[PDB]
């Protein structure tokens, strides 16, 4: 079960992976640079909201 | 049954034609402009959404 969990990170960090071919393409590239720079900041606001 | 199916797609169609109409009148045409590109858009961030 153990192993079984392992082979599921290793799917999900697989599937980052594969996110990270898709910056070639002009279409989506900048989507994804922009939301790199978004999930910091709303990063910090969530942990502000999380606080109180 | 299935010609019912058809019906009803033709109808939705229909309806889409229909919101082509409006197009001419100043008040939402700019709307509908704007609408196609948005929809553009964020297909392609539902597409990333959906594959993480
Ligand atoms: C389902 C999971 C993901 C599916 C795959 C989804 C992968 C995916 O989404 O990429 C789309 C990509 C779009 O290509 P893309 O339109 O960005 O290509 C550039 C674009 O056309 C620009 O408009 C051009 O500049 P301009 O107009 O002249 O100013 C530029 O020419 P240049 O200026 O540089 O000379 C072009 O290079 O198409 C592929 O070929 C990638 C091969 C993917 C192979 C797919 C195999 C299935
Ligand atoms: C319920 C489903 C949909 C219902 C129908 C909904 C259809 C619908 O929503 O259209 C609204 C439309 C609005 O007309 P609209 O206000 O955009 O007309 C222009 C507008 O008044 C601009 O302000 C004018 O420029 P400006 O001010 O001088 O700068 C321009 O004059 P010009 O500068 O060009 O000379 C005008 O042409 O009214 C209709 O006549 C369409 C006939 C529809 C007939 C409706 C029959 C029921």
Redesign the pocket.
């Known amino acids: 079960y153990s192993g079984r969990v392992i082979f599921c990170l290793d799917y999900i960090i697989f599937t980052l992976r594969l996110i990270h071919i898709?910056t070639?393409?002009?279409?989506?590239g900048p989507k994804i640079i922009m939301l790199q720079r978004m999930l910091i900041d709303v990063f910090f606001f969530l942990f502000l909201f999380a606080v109180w």
Do not use: K
């Open positions: 898709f070639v393409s002009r279409n989506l």
